[PDB]
Amino acid sequence: GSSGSSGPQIDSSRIRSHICSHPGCGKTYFKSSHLKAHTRTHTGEKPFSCSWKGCERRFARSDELSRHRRTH
Ligand SMILES: [Zn+2]
Numbered sequence: 680g681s682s683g684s685s686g687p688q689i690d691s692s693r694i695r696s697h698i699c700s701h702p703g704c705g706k707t708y709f710k711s712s713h714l715k716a717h718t719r720t721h722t723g724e725k726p727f728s729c730s731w732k733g734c735e736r737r738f739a740r741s742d743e744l745s746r747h748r749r750t751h
């Protein structure tokens with residue numbers, strides 16, 4: 680038997696050495712450091728967090744944050 684795990688075809692031509700250890704992810708980065716910053720999204724509930732004066736509102740997706748930090 681077999682299944683369809685193809686997924687999205689969204690990608691950008693760029694240099695990427697440090698490969699993500701986590702399986703399936705399939706995400707590599709050039710900046711040896713980037714990786715470290717990436718894993719963050721894997722560990723924990725939400726990597727991004729507003730942390731404003733009196734907001735205390737976090738988010739999982741990036742765009743979500745930026746879109747939320749617009750009304751502030
Ligand atoms: Zn990953």
Ligand SMILES: [Zn+2]
Nearest residue numbers: 729731734736
């Ligand atoms: Zn906020």
